[PDB]
Amino acid sequence: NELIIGAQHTREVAETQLLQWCDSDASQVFKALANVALQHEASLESRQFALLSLRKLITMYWSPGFEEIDVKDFIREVLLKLCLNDNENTKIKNGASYCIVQISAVDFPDQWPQLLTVIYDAISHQHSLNAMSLLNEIYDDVVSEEMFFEGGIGLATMEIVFKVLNTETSTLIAKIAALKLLKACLLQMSSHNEYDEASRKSFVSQCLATSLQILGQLLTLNFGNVDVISQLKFKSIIYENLVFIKNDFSRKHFSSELQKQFKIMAIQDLENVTHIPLLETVHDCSIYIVEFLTSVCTLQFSVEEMNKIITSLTILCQLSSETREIWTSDFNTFVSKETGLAASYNVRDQANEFFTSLPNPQLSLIFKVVSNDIEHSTCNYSTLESLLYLLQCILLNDDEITGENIDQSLQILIKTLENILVSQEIPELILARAILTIPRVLDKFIDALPDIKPLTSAFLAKSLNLALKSDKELIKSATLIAFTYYCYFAELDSVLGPEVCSETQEKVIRIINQVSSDAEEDTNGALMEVLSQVISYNPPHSRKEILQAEFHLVFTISSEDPANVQVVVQSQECLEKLLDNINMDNYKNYIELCLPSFINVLDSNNANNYRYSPLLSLVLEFITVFLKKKPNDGFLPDEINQYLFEPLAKVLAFSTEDETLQLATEAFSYLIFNTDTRAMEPRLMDIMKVLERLLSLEVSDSAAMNVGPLVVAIFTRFSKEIQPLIGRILEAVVVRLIKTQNISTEQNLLSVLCFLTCNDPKQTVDFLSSFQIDNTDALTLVMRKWIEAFEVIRGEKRIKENIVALSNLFFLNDKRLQKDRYVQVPLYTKIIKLFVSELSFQSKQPNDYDKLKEYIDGLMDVKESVVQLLVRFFKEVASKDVSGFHCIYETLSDSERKVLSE
Amino acid sequence: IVPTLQNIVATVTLGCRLDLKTVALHARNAEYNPKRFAAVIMRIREPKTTALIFASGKMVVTGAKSEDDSKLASRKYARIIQKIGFAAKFTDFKIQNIVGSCDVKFPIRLEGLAFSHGTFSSYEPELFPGLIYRMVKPKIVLLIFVSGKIVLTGAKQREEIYQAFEAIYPVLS
């Protein structure tokens, strides 16, 4: 007690004494602790605090996963009464139950399987409310399908459940946790559907069939008006069970007559709930109701039933006053919701899912009904707000809608929608939904409406002009979203004049400026996503004011929110769609437009030593993209280099972080590739410093991964001043290679040697042999490492170039190369057998919800296959025995020398 | 008549491994029931798609009626899981294959058209309606129904579907 009092930050240090005591004799410590909470000579809160100590006490020593029989048994026995005692307050029983669950999930069967017998005794004989819900919780802990059936436990559980649901005398509160027990049971039923076993499948089917009529009678049951709130909870749980049955089990297990009965009964209950923490209780209850209605969408519906559902939901999906307040005081969340980024999923959020899955005729009839329900409700506004959100819901469903009265109802509806916009007294939310939803009406009936085409321009002008004038940006905050939908199907660039297209652009651009100014990190995506679709609508002619704008938009917007992901990708996407249809002539003005902003990013990060920043990486990406987007003709004008080398040069130089160095290196190499040669050779020495450091101890192998493309880019320009620095390149490359411990990067490094020996083999081998690293020749270790590279080499694509390299290498006639089990043999002898073996193997020719998981699952190109080059090589060398090949061929084993000719 | 893509499969490699539970904890409109289709289903408001986020990090998504829509959707899934206490760079997006449907709406004498191919066309109407066909350039599975509906799968872009449609169109005509 006193020690518990002290333990329960001075309390933290005080409980350190208890922890130190536990370090000794943890086994005995456990029972001593259990006694404290057991005894009534301790404050109830103190006993709970002992309970909460027992949590961490158990983990360290009782649970081997972190790494006495009577003692642990005593804990469980005391808890039996303490946790399940009704006189105990909820907090104490809950703290106890946490101990139950921890000990059980790790030790229950071996230590004490009959714990369940105690639970059945309590829940059945004593009707203990705590006991049943505690059992439900423990269900997931240990109740396995095997133990469910073979353990026979599931049988006792289900029969207990039906017993309890028979007892009308049992309280509603009892039946709530009973129903939750029922769902816990259903989960084990879930997996068995795909593969069935006679014995257990029969019992499962009987369980389902029994459960359905119990749930039906519970539906028929009504509860006192004194306690309505619990009923709602009681009601909600019921429905969730229903859905798990329908959406998880084969049709056979649920009958059509049952579906119709439950449909009607759920609609009536939904109406009653509509007519009535209270509001959130009702509203959470309603969601599972609607979800079942969805899962039984297939069944036909009556017009009166449809009107029931409409006039009920349109009341359910009314947003509260506080949510109106939230989106009025902060519209940045609003978009996070609208684009599905929010977590909240209310009735308004589930109804939208509902109407999608309906088949055509039901959907069309519902559309007709809501058509008139709208006109009837125009007076009351919030009714129209929610009902318009719902109209959007149907409209979203892909299937067509057709109706002879639908046609004229649609003209009247369009007139009403325009009335919404022209009126200046409209509430904010409803107008925002109208802007966001009119495009759904347009898309759904694009073919239907003969006047669709001028109407698209008319609505765009009206809505966007409206999006100019709004003291509150929520209207604008929705118009931008609506613009993506507009561009979903509105080929306005084709339909509208290029001047008309550009003015609509500049229009949105100003809208984005205004909205962005205060945009929250939640929304940057949607804004720039509109930015992209606007970009795609740019019109040979080049109008630089708008393009300068759109670019600076892109980059400003990305600036504040680099870390986010859709911002990153749609940014790169935007950038690429500017550089379309660009020739060297136009390409200049883009040079000046773009490079300064990117340059300044790296310069600013220089204060951060080019340490990774999401904006840093994002800009390096942008500049890689620009680089790639050069017009095919010609080379890179030098001034591009004048701007790009020194910043990127320092980028590499200072930075050490792998991924950022890589995002730079790619653009670096690509630039150096496309660039014209004459500009580079003054930069050659600087490029050599770069390639050196990238091949250096300071930089990790991950950094060294993408040095390759640069390497070939260096040769692409010329070789004249490359040769004197070759030896330097070779020393740097080999010193990097030896220390590397990434097999992928090592393979990439060896991939470089093809062109190196392609230009000249003599200097390569001579220099490498001559050079000594710590008075040790690098050539021997390089050859050995190359051998192990073979031993793990994967990808014939590198191999084909390896043949080209070996053609250069073999004729060198290097004498030194001529000069458990470990293969330590001269190279000239070794390589021939390995390639002959590869050729010999190649002579032998080696050749919907399920399907998705399966849907998951070099430097140069040589047209000649392995066989052709190998056979011509062997004809030219074996006959001529070049490079000491006479000894190798005459002492060659004939096991696969005969298979060689194949 | 160009055949409308009735579905699209898209895949992406989210930067990091994820804990399915957290997703089911945080966004919690993902139903995650291990050992039965063991990867989290998610669905969003628009466009309508399902997506299998895998713990191992990669991802598949289906439901888009267009390449662009499939992209737009997978992006939202990346964004959402990123808001869930993880880092993920949306990379390597690709469309492993699609499926395209178009009905001629007039039955034809397909008995002889099946024999015209014979080695390719396999026809067992009593077992199940339709006819399974292979077209060489490029490889693509075609389903040709006496009813008239043509399904196509295996493509990677709209051009493959359109060209296979047109290549097999006169033969069936």
Numbering used by the authors:
A (entry chain A): 4 to 11, 16 to 74, 83 to 291, 302 to 564, 567 to 846, 872 to 899, 932 to 941, 957 to 1001
B (entry chain B): 63 to 235
Show sentences the authors wrote.
Ultimately, a cryo-EM structure of the Kap114•yTBPC complex, representing a ~130 kDa heterodimeric protein complex, was determined to an average resolution of 4.03 Å using 212,899 particles. In the Kap114•yTBPC complex, Kap114p is arranged into a right-handed superhelix and forms a 1:1 stoichiometric complex with yTBPC. Notably, Kap114p mainly wraps around the pseudosymmetric N-terminal lobe of yTBPC, primarily via three binding patches (the B α-helix and loop of HEAT8, the B α-helix of HEAT13, and the α-helix of the HEAT19 loop; highlighted by light blue, light green and light orange in Fig. 1c–e). A short α-helix in the Kap114p HEAT19 loop binds to the hydrophobic concave surface of yTBPC in a similar way to the TAF N-terminal domain (TAND) of TAF1 and a latch region of Mot121,24. Residue Y939 of Kap114p interacts with yTBPC Q158, just as F23 of TAF1-TAND1 binds to Q158 of yTBP and F123 of Mot1 binds to Q116 of EcTBP. Residues Y933 of Kap114p and F99 of yTBPC facilitate hydrophobic interactions, comparable to those of Mot1 F129 to EcTBP F57/F74 and TAF1-TAND1 Y19 to yTBP F99/F116. Among these five residues, R90 and N91, located near the α-helix 1 of yTBPC, are bound by the HEAT8 loop of Kap114p and exhibit close contacts with the HEAT8 loop via residues S369 and Y370. The other three signature residues—R137, R141 and K145—are located at α-helix 2 of yTBPC and interact with the HEAT8 loop and HEAT13B. In particular, the double mutant combining Y370A on Kap114p and N91A on yTBPC resulted in a Kd value of ~1.5 μM for the complex, i.e., more than a thousand-fold weaker than wild type. Hence, Kap114p binding does not induce substantial conformational changes in yTBPC, consistent with our understanding of how other TBP-associated factors promote TBP remodeling as a consequence of binding without changing the TBP structure.
